[PDB]
Design an enzyme around this catalytic site. Structure first.
Site: not given
Ligand code: PPH
Ligand code: PPH
Lengths: 672, 672
Positions: B86, B233, B309, B312, B315, B345, B361, B417, B445, B448
């Site tokens: 291949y 590839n 406190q 967020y 704290r 591959n 790949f 600002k 493709e 595939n």
């Protein structure tokens, strides 16, 4: 001349959005939906979709019967001559190369293999029964046009299922838009062994039981050629649900416009943000209309009559809502065309003696309109969140208590703080839901369906967004009514403080024989100061009332010149006496005034009674029994939200909403 | 025993994140990147990707050559015997049924048809040259492992292109992860007629010119069987870019941790939010580390030493950043594995005398890590926006001027600002970019490639997010240095006000012979009041200084008893005199103090000089020449942002950032 039908579509977008909503509401309330194939409105779909005992019935136009019979006869006749017809003697979709002459057997097979949905236990994977009823109505309307080749008796059977509230169970998922779910309507009509229906009180019925309760006689149908394909090859589930969604979305957009004005009222915003010149000069009709509606509320407001720039959620609300209204309106016309379209394939054209192959099952108008509308709903939600956020924030709400706290002791009343957190959670999930569905198309069905609309999936997500917008609208509306009552409390307690300061000032300063510029300046302190900055402990030395009153006496003493140097005419020597008399008297006077107001006998009536927005307040407060929220009682904000949310979901807010605008002549106030 | 390699991966996640970043920085600065196929780090990719004249060079391990030659010889030998392989004697992808014995011609064809990208004019559709260099380095590292069947001489040629900064032009788009873009590296190596490269100063070069400038001798390569597939590839473009992104993302996460602490310093936040007990009890290591780093900065802070406190963004900053650091760290290890993987591959296994067909790949580790990291970057951005928003808001910044305005006249100085508006625009676009790429896979493709990773597209979007995070970090950092200088101004002007009030109080109230409880209470007013609430017009009757000073004199007069009734010992009779003397003196005293501070001679030194965070301030202020922003001069905030952004993009912030933590022993402070 209008060969591509752009002109007739444009004609449907004339007149105001509000007049369209008034028409929708009247249409919804009619006792009979007459179907002829081409006059269905979203409000008729919404009315039929209801399972609330309204009594609305469907009837089929006899004028449609001949065309329906003609194409049904044509299909049967083309079988007798033994021709080759897609979906009649050939396979389906990517497998359409298979041939057969068992026409009835093919339609039986079609319904069998499309019954590929999954219900499981319970209802979480089942289409809501209202949406199934919408789908059934839209499918009848398509088939009535006579291009589908189905027997009129089958449409009569579906009509009985609607009128007797016998609903086939459909799977929630399975469609890329609506073969799989529509095949469960076909399966009920043919008495498939797995077919189930639900009765009016939720009882699960067999197909035999369902036929008996619905009044269908003649036994199960045996589908003739093409009849199974005619039942399932359309967009009725997605478009039926989109119709229900848009009915509520149109109403909620008007609610958002009116609540923006009531918001302006209780915030003491500057009404000039609705001035027609501003909006005329942008040309956008949604913005112009939204401004004119808010201007109408504000022009009849007893709070505006009691009056550097407001923040954007108030001042840019017409610019913000305008394009959302336009999208919702344009989307409505798209869906209204879809529910009156011949969404089927192939089409039987008896005039040309042939079947026409095409793509009218491709529900793209549904996916697009529902994606665009969902983004518009999220924007209306975001504005509502921003307005609510300003309303409960004492930095921005022009003298209302932080959290819209209602009781005597703010340390034990955090008002709408929990609701405000909930509103952020609603808004956040709404912005998530604003993402589109239609950019997730898969190449489907052995790549035969390499584009597909995903219309029903999008309608479902827009339905979820509308539900959240109702949660937000409910919470906001109850907050606005709380603010109204706090402005009533504010005016009455301020009047009492003024009267007490005046009586003490007379008694103590009527020597040095009457200190008159002093009394009027002390009264100006009370006029100027925010009542809710001190009224929970009005004689505290660290709160602004006593501090500014003393500052005023000191200022007058420093201007008192030579008289200040004689103890008999010294203003400074009166301060300790003034403060002692006020501390002895103002607390109980404030309490008596508040108790009197709580008993329904305030010195000054609630100004909302003279506002055009009164119908909404009156409905929430008097009709629904929603109560002023206070830490001095055990009732939670959610208990009051329930009353409004349930009423909203039953459509009960429609009447007071429209009443608030019913004297509007539909035009802006003149600027010339 | 570790048969699935979970254990060795887990081992790579021990030790602190900060130590990993220190190692990355040292690695980046090494003069030579030695490639052997299996020790590449993201910091080596980042160093090589630079086109800034650092002088770093690549060299290939001679130990790799034998394995590379073996698989190249195997491929050639299997041609001589004439087998079926291949990508060697068969077609590609979905068309692999085609057969041929023209092995060289097949590889020539492969590069031709993959040259399917579009450049157009200009650079908008071209891959950035740094990312092309990253891709080239990663591809060499893959091919060096000897499983690919390519000649070592081709790797030597790519190395010369890197070392001489001769870069082939690659298209920006075209890959679902990286055939199309990698084929433009192959095209340069084979001298394709459309191939172009760029020289070190941007000159466009022909392939012949590029070979000559790079020092490649021997003419264009003629690809042997499999060599074209071996070049194209793999996942080198997506993973190379992900490496560059993660190098900066790791550094920016440490910057975000340190700026959270400097933010806490100038906000006068409560340092207990970093207490180790809190973070120990959640177990999350990113949160524990982030807390300990902030605690380290704060423990060596001269501002904390100067201390219901905090909000967020201050704290909960360790809880917020912790999981983001963990995601960035985990994502780094995923990419480091990918850039040392055999992504090719088929694989040539000379030991078993066969080619192994597989899917290496498939760049899924890239797409996943880049989607997860992009969401983490958006979260770091959102926290930075929230912190910046608190910093410039006078409701929340504990006495700093609104907008961090710097000049004498706030009516002509709106400080940050404009930058604050820009920060919202950066944050908004970052939240948009946080959406994933990898849920948009198309069946490709001829179906595939019915799953594909989209790794490079995701790396590109995460690269864009990092750039925006640098815009936000630049703006925030300059704001923090402005705030530092405003705290210095604040302490000096407060000291001057105290001294002036004290001298006036002595001179005017030293009668009734010395009013001593009075002077100390007047000084307590100055200690208590926010300088920036009045110092632009300190003797104004409507500002808090004069109002509270008078209130104090009045309070003492009302407690003065019988002495208040004698004009000689009356405190009230001193108020007008006290206020006149203060108005005559305090303005010029405040001006002299401010002028002295502006000349580098403040009465009280800038406390930042004694903080562990000083290296960052010193670098921004002294090394870069970033200046204190003021409406009294013409310089805009953007002009100062430029200096920091350009330095940040050159890596110049790394050294002062790490210097601020260099005495940290890596552990939290004891809680026992
Ligand atoms: N929408 C197709 C009808 C169909 C039915 C059942 C399975 C697959 C397809 P069309 O009308 O385009 O053939
Ligand atoms: N990734 C494939 C190689 C290929 C090259 C050119 C066009 C199409 C595919 P595989 O290695 O899976 O065959």
């Amino acid at each position: 001349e209008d060969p591509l039908y752009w002109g007739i579509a444009a004609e449907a977008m004339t007149g105001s959005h509000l007049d369209e909503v008034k028409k929708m509401v009247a249409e919804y309330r009619k006792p009979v939906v007459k179907l002829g194939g081409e006059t269905l409105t979203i409000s008729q779909v919404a009315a039929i979709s209801a399972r609330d005992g309204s009594g609305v019935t469907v009837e089929l136009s006899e004028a449609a019967r001949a065309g329906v019979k003609a194409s049904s006869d044509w299909v049967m006749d083309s079988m007798n001559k033994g021709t080759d017809s897609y979906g009649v003697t050939t396979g389906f979709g990517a497998t359409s190369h298979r041939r057969t002459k068992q026409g009835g057997a093919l339609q039986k097979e079609l319904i069998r293999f499309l019954n590929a949905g999954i219900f499981g236990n319970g209802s979480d994977n089942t289409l809501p029964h209202s949406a199934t009823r919408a789908a059934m109505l839209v499918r009848i309307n398509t088939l009535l046009q006579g291009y589908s080749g189905i027997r009129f008796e089958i449409l009569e059977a579906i009509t009985k299922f609607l009128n007797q509230n016998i609903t086939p169970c459909l799977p929630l998922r399975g469609t890329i838009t609506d073969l799989v779910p529509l095949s469960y309507i076909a399966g009920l009509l043919t008495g498939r062994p797995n077919s189930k229906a639900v009765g009016p009180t939720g009882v699960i019925l067999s197909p035999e039981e369902a036929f008996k309760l619905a009044g269908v006689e003649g036994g199960f149908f045996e589908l003739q050629p093409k009849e199974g394909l005619a039942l399932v090859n359309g967009t009725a589930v997605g478009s039926g649900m989109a119709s229900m969604v848009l009915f509520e979305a149109n109403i909620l957009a008007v609610l958002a416009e009116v609540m923006s004005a009531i918001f302006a009222e209780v915030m003491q915003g500057k009404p000039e943000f609705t001035d027609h010149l501003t909006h005329k000069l942008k040309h956008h009709p949604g913005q112009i209309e939204a401004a004119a509606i808010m201007e109408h509320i504000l022009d009849g407001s007893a709070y505006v009559k009691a009056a550097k720039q407001d923040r954007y959620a108030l001042r840019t609300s017409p610019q913000w809502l305008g394009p959302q209204i336009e999208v919702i309106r344009s989307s409505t016309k798209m869906i209204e065309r879809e529910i009156n379209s011949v969404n089927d394939n192939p089409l039987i054209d008896v005039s040309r003696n042939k079947a026409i192959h095409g793509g009218n099952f491709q529900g793209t108008p549904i996916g697009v309109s529902m994606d665009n509308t969902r983004l518009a709903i999220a924007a209306i939600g975001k504005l509502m969140f921003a307005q609510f956020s300003e309303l409960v924030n004492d930095f921005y709400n022009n003298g209302l208590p932080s959290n819209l706290s209602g009781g005597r002791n703010p340390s034990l009343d955090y008002g709408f703080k929990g609701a405000e957190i909930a509103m952020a959670s609603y808004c956040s999930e709404l912005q998530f839901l604003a993402n589109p569905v239609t950019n997730h198309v898969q190449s489907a069905e052995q790549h035969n369906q390499d584009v597909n609309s995903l219309g029903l999936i999008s309608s479902r997500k827009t339905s979820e967004a509308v539900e959240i917008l109702k949660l937000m609208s409910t919470t906001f509306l109850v907050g606005l009514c709380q603010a109204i009552d706090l402005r009533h409390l504010e005016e009455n307690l301020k009047s009492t403080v003024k009267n007490t300061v005046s009586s003490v000032a007379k008694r103590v300063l009527t020597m040095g024989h009457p200190s008159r510029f002093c009394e009027k300046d002390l009264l100006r302190v009370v006029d100027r100061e925010y009542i809710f900055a001190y009224i929970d402990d009005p004689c505290s030395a660290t709160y602004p009332l006593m501090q500014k009153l003393r500052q005023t006496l000191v200022e007058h003493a420093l201007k008192n010149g030579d008289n200040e140097r004689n103890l008999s005419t010294s203003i400074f020597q009166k301060i300790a006496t003034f403060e002692d008399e006020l501390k002895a008297l103002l607390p109980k006077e404030v309490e008596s005034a508040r108790a009197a107001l709580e008993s329904g006998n305030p010195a000054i009536p609630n100004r909302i009674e003279e506002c055009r927005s009164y119908p909404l307040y009156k409905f929430v407060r008097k009709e629904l029994g929603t109560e002023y929220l206070t830490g001095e009682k055990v009732t939670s904000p959610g208990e009051e939200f329930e009353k409004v949310f349930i009423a909203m979901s039953k459509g009960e807010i429609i009447d007071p909403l429209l009443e608030s605008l019913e004297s509007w002549n539909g035009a802006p106030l003149p600027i010339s």
